[PDB]
Design a protein around this ligand. Structure first.
Ligand SMILES: C[C@@H](c1cccc2c(-c3ccc(CS(C)(=O)=O)c(F)c3)c(C(=O)O)[nH]c12)N1CC(CCN)OC1=O
Ligand SMILES: [Zn+2]
Ligand SMILES: [Zn+2]
Length: 231
């Protein structure tokens, strides 16, 4: 019943967690540079179909994700959006594409994925290139807050449930640093978080890219840990 962690998640297995009516997160674990990390994504019911946000960080994890969705939900995943270019967001796009899923990301994410040798979503999401931009995509709104964890990071809001999926631009409350900052803009990140706070003041659940969901406090906590990481 509690939100799952690695200690319940061997690498290769996937858990789903019901967030709200028609909204689940997915949780998987992966090894990277000799350490094991959890990571989240989102699943949103879209009538008789499902919209997937982010892969489960790897090909085998993403295959396991599709199997877990069939077991627990039983509706087809028809579209997926990746919220930035890192492997915890696009690793598994090839699996999705061979399982009938149409894969999408911004042009900025597609270019960065291609340049870095990561898997590349098929379709480009226009209308998101300026900070503060928002577009509708099925049952969600996609929002580009500005550079934060990465220059391309997108945020996803589920208006029916007031669920804010921050992706890796948002950290969990227990975080002690800003995570993997390799491609981050620590100077711009607080401004981007402030844009999220201003745009989604009615969010009830906030889901970070890694770790435990909570409420709006995750946004302020993220700004706090990023400002202190920078300093
Ligand atoms: C594949 C991805 C990656 C791999 C491994 C770990 C992470 C973390 C991470 C780290 C620590 C914490 C605990 S905490 C908030 O207290 O510090 C955390 F929650 C998340 C993140 C993230 O923060 O989103 N991304 C990671 N990658 C790869 C990459 C550059 C490759 N050239 O950059 C990146 O992010
Ligand atoms: Zn990342
Ligand atoms: Zn991440």
């Amino acid at each position: 019943g509690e939100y799952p962690t690695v200690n319940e998640i061997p690498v290769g297995e996937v858990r789903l967690y019901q967030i709200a009516d028609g909204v689940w997160s997915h949780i998987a674990t992966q090894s990277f540079d000799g350490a094991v990390y959890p990571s989240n994504g989102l699943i949103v019911r879209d009538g008789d179909e499902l919209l997937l946000i982010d892969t489960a960080w790897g090909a085998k994890n993403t295959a396991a994700l599709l199997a877990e969705i069939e077991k627990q939900i039983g509706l087809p995943v028809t579209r997926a959006v990746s919220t930035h270019f890192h492997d915890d967001r696009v690793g598994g796009v090839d699996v999705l594409r061979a399982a009938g899923v149409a894969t999408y990301a911004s042009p900025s994410t597609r270019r960065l994925a291609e340049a870095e040798g990561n898997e590349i979503p098929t379709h480009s999401l226009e209308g998101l290139s300026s900070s503060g931009d928002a577009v509708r995509f099925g049952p969600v709104e996609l929002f580009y807050p500005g550079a934060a964890h990465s220059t391309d990071n997108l945020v996803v809001y589920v208006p029916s449930a007031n669920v804010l999926y921050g992706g890796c631009a948002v950290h969990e409350l227990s975080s002690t640093s800003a995570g993997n900052v390799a491609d981050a803009d620590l100077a711009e990140w607080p401004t981007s978080v402030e844009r999220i706070q201003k745009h989604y003041p009615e969010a009830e659940v906030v889901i970070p890219g890694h770790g435990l969901p909570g409420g709006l406090d995750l946004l302020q906590h993220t700004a706090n840990v990023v400002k202190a990481h920078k300093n």
